[PDB]
Amino acid sequence: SHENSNSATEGSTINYTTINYYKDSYAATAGKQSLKQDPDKFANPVKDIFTEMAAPLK
Amino acid sequence: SHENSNSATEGSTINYTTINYYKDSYAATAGKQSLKQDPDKFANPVKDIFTEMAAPLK
Amino acid sequence: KIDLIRTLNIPVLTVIEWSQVHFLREIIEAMLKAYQQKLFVTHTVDELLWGY
Amino acid sequence: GDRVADMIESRALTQALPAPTGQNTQVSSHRLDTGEVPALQAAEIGASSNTSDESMIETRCVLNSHSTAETTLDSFFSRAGLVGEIDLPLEGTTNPSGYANWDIDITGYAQMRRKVELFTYMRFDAEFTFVACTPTGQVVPQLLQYMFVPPGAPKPESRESLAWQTATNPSVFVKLTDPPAQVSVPFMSPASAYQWFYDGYPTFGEHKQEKDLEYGACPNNMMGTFSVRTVGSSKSKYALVVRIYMRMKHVRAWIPRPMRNQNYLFKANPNYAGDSIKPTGTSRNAITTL
Amino acid sequence: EIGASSNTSDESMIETRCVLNSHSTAETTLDSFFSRAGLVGEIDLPLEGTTNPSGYANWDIDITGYAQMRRKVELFTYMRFDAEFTFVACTPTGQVVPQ
Amino acid sequence: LLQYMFVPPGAPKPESRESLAWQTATNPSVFVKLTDPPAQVSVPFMSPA
Amino acid sequence: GFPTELKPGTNQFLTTDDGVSAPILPNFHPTPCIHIPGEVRNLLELCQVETILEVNNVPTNATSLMERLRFPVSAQAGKGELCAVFRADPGRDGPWQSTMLGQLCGYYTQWSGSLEVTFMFTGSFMATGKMLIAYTPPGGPLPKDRATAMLGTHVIWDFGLQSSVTLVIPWISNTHYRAHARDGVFDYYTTGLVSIWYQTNYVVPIGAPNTAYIIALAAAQKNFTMKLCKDTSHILQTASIQ
Amino acid sequence: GFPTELKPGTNQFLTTDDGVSAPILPNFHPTPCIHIPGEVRNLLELCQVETILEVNNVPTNATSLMERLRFPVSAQAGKGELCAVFRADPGRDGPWQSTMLGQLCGYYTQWSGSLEVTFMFTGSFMATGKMLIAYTPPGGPLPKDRATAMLGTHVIWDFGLQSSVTLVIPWISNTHYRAHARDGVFDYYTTGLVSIWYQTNYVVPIGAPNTAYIIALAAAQKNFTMKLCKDTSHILQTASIQ
Amino acid sequence: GFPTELKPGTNQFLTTDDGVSAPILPNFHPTPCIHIPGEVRNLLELCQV
Amino acid sequence: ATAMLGTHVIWDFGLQSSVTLVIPWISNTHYRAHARDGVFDYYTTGLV
Amino acid sequence: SDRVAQLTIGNSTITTQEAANIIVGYGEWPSYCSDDDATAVDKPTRPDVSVNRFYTLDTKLWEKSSKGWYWKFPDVLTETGVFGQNAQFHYLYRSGFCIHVQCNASKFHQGALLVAILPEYVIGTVAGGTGTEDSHPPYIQTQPGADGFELQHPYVLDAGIPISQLTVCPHQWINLRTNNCATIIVPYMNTLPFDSALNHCNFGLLVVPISPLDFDQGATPVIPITITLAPMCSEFAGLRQAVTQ
Numbered sequence A, B: 001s002h003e004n005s006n007s008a009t010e011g012s013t014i015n016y017t018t019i020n021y022y023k024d025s026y027a028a029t030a031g032k033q034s035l036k037q038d039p040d041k042f043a044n045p046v047k048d049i050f051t052e053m054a055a056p057l058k
Numbered sequence C: 001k002i003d004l005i006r007t008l009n010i011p012v013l014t015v016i017e018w019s020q021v022h023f024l025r026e027i028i029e030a031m032l033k034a035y036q037q038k039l040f041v042t043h044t045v046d047e048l049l050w051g052y
Numbered sequence D: 001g002d003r004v005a006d007m008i009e010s011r012a013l014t015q016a017l018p019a020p021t022g023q024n025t026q027v028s029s030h031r032l033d034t035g036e037v038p039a040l041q042a043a044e045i046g047a048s049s050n051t052s053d054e055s056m057i058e059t060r061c062v063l064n065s066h067s068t069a070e071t072t073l074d075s076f077f078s079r080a081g082l083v084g085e086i087d088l089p090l091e092g093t094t095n096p097s098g099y100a101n102w103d104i105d106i107t108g109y110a111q112m113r114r115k116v117e118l119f120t121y122m123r124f125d126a127e128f129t130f131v132a133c134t135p136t137g138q139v140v141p142q143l144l145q146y147m148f149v150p151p152g153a154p155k156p157e158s159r160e161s162l163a164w165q166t167a168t169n170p171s172v173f174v175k176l177t178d179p180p181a182q183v184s185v186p187f188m189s190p191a192s193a194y195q196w197f198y199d200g201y202p203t204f205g206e207h208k209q210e211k212d213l214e215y216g217a218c219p220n221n222m223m224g225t226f227s228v229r230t231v232g233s234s235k236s237k238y239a240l241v242v243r244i245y246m247r248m249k250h251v252r253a254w255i256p257r258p259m260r261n262q263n264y265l266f267k268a269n270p271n272y273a274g275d276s277i278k279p280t281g282t283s284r285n286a287i288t289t290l
Numbered sequence E: 001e002i003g004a005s006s007n008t009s010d011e012s013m014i015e016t017r018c019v020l021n022s023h024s025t026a027e028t029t030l031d032s033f034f035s036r037a038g039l040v041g042e043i044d045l046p047l048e049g050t051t052n053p054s055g056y057a058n059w060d061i062d063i064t065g066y067a068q069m070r071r072k073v074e075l076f077t078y079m080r081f082d083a084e085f086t087f088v089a090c091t092p093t094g095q096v097v098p099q
Numbered sequence F: 001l002l003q004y005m006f007v008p009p010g011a012p013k014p015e016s017r018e019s020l021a022w023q024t025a026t027n028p029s030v031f032v033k034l035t036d037p038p039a040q041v042s043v044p045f046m047s048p049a
Numbered sequence G, H: 001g002f003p004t005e006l007k008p009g010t011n012q013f014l015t016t017d018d019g020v021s022a023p024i025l026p027n028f029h030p031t032p033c034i035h036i037p038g039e040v041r042n043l044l045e046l047c048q049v050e051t052i053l054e055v056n057n058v059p060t061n062a063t064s065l066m067e068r069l070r071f072p073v074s075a076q077a078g079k080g081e082l083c084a085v086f087r088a089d090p091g092r093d094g095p096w097q098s099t100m101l102g103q104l105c106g107y108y109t110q111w112s113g114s115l116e117v118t119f120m121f122t123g124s125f126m127a128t129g130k131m132l133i134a135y136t137p138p139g140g141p142l143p144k145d146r147a148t149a150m151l152g153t154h155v156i157w158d159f160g161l162q163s164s165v166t167l168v169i170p171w172i173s174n175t176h177y178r179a180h181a182r183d184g185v186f187d188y189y190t191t192g193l194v195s196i197w198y199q200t201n202y203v204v205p206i207g208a209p210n211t212a213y214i215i216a217l218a219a220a221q222k223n224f225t226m227k228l229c230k231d232t233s234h235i236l237q238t239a240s241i242q
Numbered sequence I: 001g002f003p004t005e006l007k008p009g010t011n012q013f014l015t016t017d018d019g020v021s022a023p024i025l026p027n028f029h030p031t032p033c034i035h036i037p038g039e040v041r042n043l044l045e046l047c048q049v
Numbered sequence J: 001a002t003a004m005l006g007t008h009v010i011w012d013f014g015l016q017s018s019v020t021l022v023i024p025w026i027s028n029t030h031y032r033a034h035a036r037d038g039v040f041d042y043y044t045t046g047l048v
Numbered sequence K: 001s002d003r004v005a006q007l008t009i010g011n012s013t014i015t016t017q018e019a020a021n022i023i024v025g026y027g028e029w030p031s032y033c034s035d036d037d038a039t040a041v042d043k044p045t046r047p048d049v050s051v052n053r054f055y056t057l058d059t060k061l062w063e064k065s066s067k068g069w070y071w072k073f074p075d076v077l078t079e080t081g082v083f084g085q086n087a088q089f090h091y092l093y094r095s096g097f098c099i100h101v102q103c104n105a106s107k108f109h110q111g112a113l114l115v116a117i118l119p120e121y122v123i124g125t126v127a128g129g130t131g132t133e134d135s136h137p138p139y140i141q142t143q144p145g146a147d148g149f150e151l152q153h154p155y156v157l158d159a160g161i162p163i164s165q166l167t168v169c170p171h172q173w174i175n176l177r178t179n180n181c182a183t184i185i186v187p188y189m190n191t192l193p194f195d196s197a198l199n200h201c202n203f204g205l206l207v208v209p210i211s212p213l214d215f216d217q218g219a220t221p222v223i224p225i226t227i228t229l230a231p232m233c234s235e236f237a238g239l240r241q242a243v244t245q
């Protein structure tokens, strides 16, 4: 595994399980990626995050 | 061996000897499965299991 | 073909007769019980006389 | 927060033992013994009889090394059987314009259907294989596109349609000079098992005679539509057939049931011929002869 | 009117039971939603005609020409991806020719 | 295109080209065309003795 | 050389295989990425954003297509009238085709999980009332009066300083995932009905408008999953795209 | 690239190979399984369940096909009459085609192991008698009187409170497995004959029915194995299944 | 996929090669052998009689 | 098929000749007085 | 110690003193849905007494020329008692069943029955007689209710499957020289953990006389067959208004 870092997914800490045969990383498999999701930057991107139980407009 | 658990035979303790080349477990070999059989749930599924030697209706 | 004629229902009085001679008794007695019918129906003239 | 004793007080009988070979026969001798009788069973219990060889006849020590591996479900079902045939003729009535939508129902041929109707619920992966050729048998340099249309996807309505762009559907482009296209298919049903038998109706409401067509039709079994066209704007100059073979792998089957003895007549219903109910075996003239 | 999606759950609206949800969220990632080969271009090289009659064709790479691949990738504004193109070529009747 | 199939003792012999026994629901069968190399399959020791 | 036997599946082009293919450009290092805001890791970010459900899918002409986004309430002279009713399934053709929950679900064959509907009352300040928002589970037909839709899952919604309420349609099913409910035997996978009933009235003082509009927002919960990706039902092309 | 030589067997489609093939759906996680009762791990569960052997395979018309499941006994006026006789092999066309032992053995070329036949007497309470159920090993022909079928393996069966007895046909063979016995040189693999003889009589009091019926149940023992799977002999299709 | 070059000798049927070929019957366990007298291990038993 | 809904006993005629229906103590009150016709029928015990 | 039994559940008990034995279908008792299996997110109702009762349903007379009967469960109890009220209000449903069928006769009568279960007992037709017209069975042959329905061709069980190998499924015999009743305890068998109680009928109770009834004239000619059943470990979910069908 002495390939170049050519893939368009470089920019995370963990690597992926992509098998590759050429010396270029963009020719690799798509593989399986990390199942991390962050819905709070699209669902509730408010400044001061209010909880569920309280009334939102105190 | 960094595949997903996609096969329709997940649900036992032991795995099988199935060789796989893709990242999905349902694309694997059928392999050889465990030779465990339980005939007593179809042959004699009685509540209080009577033995061979005794008369069945005491 | 518009004129509605209200009278008895002859098929459901026919199949009661079939239950009296034990010609398909428990089949017909399951029909009229779960599918409740009418002794008096109302169809058109061309239906009641030329097939319905 | 209670003072009652009714609420505070408010599991399988069989163990699967490993059995790689059939069991041995230990040495028995004669027995002249009252009280215990291994022959006289009670068949009205509804249990199969647990009388062995040794307590009926004097037997010898037989070390049974006969393997029971051929009779597992993964060795009984993992054989590719013919489950579908798709015709793409040049001129005719049935698909004259070089496309065919075959909805995936593998109960259309009576050798694969007969085996998998032994069990009620089956959960399996499958690998389909699409052996395609001219009706005379020969292979012709013709390109085909197979695509799998799930329930809800647009069915392609013509050869030069827009649904053949396969932006998200899986599709296979194979020519007939190639070996047969073989793809593996997971367990896709919403339920936990493909039930071959659904005694019930899918929809609510009153059930009249006009909508008895839904009886026995479970939506957990109908998994879509398999579509195939000859790739091109013009019409292809070859008549085609596409035979579909599937073998099942990673099989789990539940709840056995009696195997069909009358001829199959339709798909997705057990309708049988009424005047032609034939006996399940052969017959003989008298019982006291052979 | 805050502009936040509501954080009300099931449990604080109805009496619920303990459901151990083992439904995977791996089919909905971007690498499983986009890694399907969709038709993005078609190049015609006819024998006689107007459109490319002399056996060459210059197709400038714009994959917004067909509305199934274009519809999905227009959900996002900025996309960074590697691609593997595949060029399925044949006669207009469909057959393969030694060319 | 050819179909070879192996009919054990007891299986239905196919009686025509367009028969029903060619569905090979449980028999082993080989589909090879003549442009391919020769179909080669290995056969175990099958005798009862 | 090494012995190799070519098994079937050879020489095909499956459009969903995940295979290594030859690079056109040797050792090409691409442009390094910038922290661009709002990165999507998963499509279940987008199914959890509330998005305007068009309950009032009645008007169709081009000069009144903005009428679809909101449905009216008004001062009724009576007892428990039906305000609006809609199917509660994101796959069926209807109100849910405008929300992104209902159009990302157009790419997936079968979905699961509970899903939420939010109703924002856009009346005046001094106009009050109480609405009953009742989710009827499948099998139970369209309710004929307020005292039979009361039996299902329901929410009593008060008009107050917090303007909106969330009906949370729970995950009630006979099956783990359900596919898209259409007419036929695929109506086995219906989700139910959501019907909105006046519980008391819509009372106003003199000087307030006696007709107010409710905007229905809809999204999914955090136990919402989808699987078995497919192509969507609408094809957004008629001719050659020039 | 890497040197690779394509040996024969290339480009074929063997319908029994166990090979890796390409997945149509990347990272699709299926529906998780439920504990559904009665899971079959092996087909030798089903060969050990007793199942109605139709010894009386004589009547054929559709109004009397239920007559096949049971064969009569009656008060004989004599000494040792033959009640019924049948072939003792599950492969041959005859009585054994109704039992699931005899139709799962239709999928396997050759079987082995001892197998049991159970006879449930369905007469009245106060009707007694003794029957001799004799298994004659192969070679020995159909016995002509009770004193030659006595020589084989046999069971004296008394009618009592325990209603049924089990004749256990032992595994007597010259070979480890035997294939299906048919007429010809495949009759080498015959299993024998089972003949049922009155040993004393069938005595009744006045008021009891003087004709009783015996239901023959049949299964296999726990040393029953099968191998070399094949397709079954009946094809359950005549035309295109519509 | 993996790069593979097909060198000559491809697609032939040599009648003396010792190659793996596909099994027609999955997990078929044959009949276990008996001590049958007079087993030949080599043909040079028979040249010395 | 409506008396089936209450407390009931399926009694088989056998070698043990008798069965015991056990009328349980089902009441709205701790003790009940003697049920007669009128407003004293409030204390009825039921029917067998 | 096997001939005599007593089955008490709910407020209703049944005694039997000439039983055979209790068989438990597929070797396991009915149980509640674990949280590994459940997908519905509302808390189920579990009445635990008011619906776990032996409901005595109907009485079929068995003469010398009968064919056989079948009852589709649980549609025999969606018109009866608090089970029939909870199954009509609630969309989802799961339960097991303890099925007890009585048929007594004297010690001079004879004959045997095969009371057997089978899951997903779908019903075919005679296909127009000759076998060319796709006729579907009516709603009353499909789901007869508590009235039961009589088999037309019991050799093929109206489904093209032979009755000679019905004995695979959970069963036991009532032959009138030995026993008079047959208890069959059946768990909840279905793929998905809850289902609708009005559409899907999980199994059918085939009760077929194989060896026919026989008695000399002078004995009692009326030999009834009554089936009693008890939903065990039943639970419902998804409350809405009453549907009847």
Ligand SMILES: *[C@@H]1O[C@H](CO)[C@@H](O[C@@H]2O[C@H](CO)[C@@H](O[C@@H]3O[C@H](CO[C@H]4O[C@H](CO[C@H]5O[C@H](CO)[C@@H](O)[C@H](O)[C@@H]5O[C@H]5O[C@H](CO)[C@@H](O)[C@H](O)[C@@H]5O)[C@@H](O)[C@H](O[C@H]5O[C@H](CO)[C@@H](O)[C@H](O)[C@@H]5O[C@H]5O[C@H](CO)[C@@H](O)[C@H](O)[C@@H]5O)[C@@H]4O)[C@@H](O)[C@H](O[C@H]4O[C@H](CO)[C@@H](O)[C@H](O)[C@@H]4O[C@H]4O[C@H](CO)[C@@H](O)[C@H](O)[C@@H]4O[C@H]4O[C@H](CO)[C@@H](O)[C@H](O)[C@@H]4O)[C@@H]3O)[C@H](O)[C@H]2NC(C)=O)[C@H](O)[C@H]1NC(C)=O
Residues within 6 Å of the ligand: C020, C021, C022, C025, K063, K065, K066, K067
């Ligand atoms: C018009 O015109 C028309 C024409 O005619 C008409 O019509 C009619 O009508 C009428 C009225 O309805 C009728 O009559 C009636 O009839 C009926 C019927 O009969 C029939 O049927 C039968 C049946 O059978 C069955 O069963 C048996 C046993 O029982 C068996 O064996 C069989 O097999 C069968 O079975 C089946 O079915 C079932 C059902 O349930 C089922 O389940 C199963 O599965 C199976 O399937 C029959 O049998 C009959 O037969 C007959 O005929 C023949 C010929 O071929 C012969 O062979 C025979 O033998 C017979 O005969 C006999 O019988 C009859 C009676 O039955 C007599 O009559 C004579 O004579 C001789 O003897 C038939 O087919 C019936 O039922 C009825 O009867 C009744 O009544 C009378 C008077 O009325 C009297 O006398 C009698 O006795 C009776 O009584 C009884 O019953 C009732 C009701 O049920 C009751 O309640 C009472 O109580 C009584 O009982 C008693 O006694 C007995 C003795 O008998 C005893 O056993 C007991 O125990 C008790 O003690 C009547 O008759 C007719 O039919 C018609 N027609 C024709 C031709 O048909 C009209 O009407 C006109 N119109 C005006 C207005 O008039």
Ligand SMILES: *[C@@H]1O[C@H](CO)[C@@H](O[C@@H]2O[C@H](CO)[C@@H](O[C@@H]3O[C@H](CO)[C@@H](O)[C@H](O[C@H]4O[C@H](CO)[C@@H](O)[C@H](O)[C@@H]4O)[C@@H]3O)[C@H](O)[C@H]2NC(C)=O)[C@H](O)[C@H]1NC(C)=O
Residues within 6 Å of the ligand: C003, C004, C005, C006, C042
């Ligand atoms: C035999 O007797 C029966 C009853 O004794 C009788 O049946 C009834 O006939 C009337 C008249 O035809 C039917 O009433 C009609 O029903 C239709 C369906 O809804 C309505 O649209 C009709 O409304 C019209 O009524 C006026 C004309 O009558 C118009 O002024 C008006 O604008 C409407 O157009 C009308 O009410 C009735 O439905 C039946 N009832 C049944 C149960 O069938 C039948 O007509 C008699 N036959 C003969 C030959 O006399």
Ligand SMILES: CCO/N=C/c1ccc(OCC[C@@H](C)CCN2CCN(c3ccnc(N)c3)C2=O)cc1
Residues within 6 Å of the ligand: D104, D105, D106, D107, D126, D128, D146, D147, D148, D170, D171, D172, D183, D185, D194, D195, D196, D197, D221, D222, D223, D226, D267, D268, H024
């Ligand atoms: C390029 C893309 O290539 N794609 C190939 C491809 C192949 C197969 C495929 O889906 C296969 C589905 C089968 C495995 C199971 C079929 N089943 C389930 C039970 N069932 C029943 C149940 C009850 N009654 C009836 N009538 C039928 C039935 O028929 C999808 C895609």
Ligand SMILES: CCO/N=C/c1ccc(OCC[C@@H](C)CCN2CCN(c3ccnc(N)c3)C2=O)cc1
Residues within 6 Å of the ligand: E061, E062, E063, E064, E083, E085, G024
């Ligand atoms: C022998 C050599 O084989 N060579 C093959 C080969 C294949 C592809 C290739 O380049 C592929 C480029 C695509 C990956 C991206 C195309 N893109 C980017 C965004 N974009 C947009 C954006 C905004 N408006 C419009 N209209 C279009 C667009 O169309 C080069 C070479």
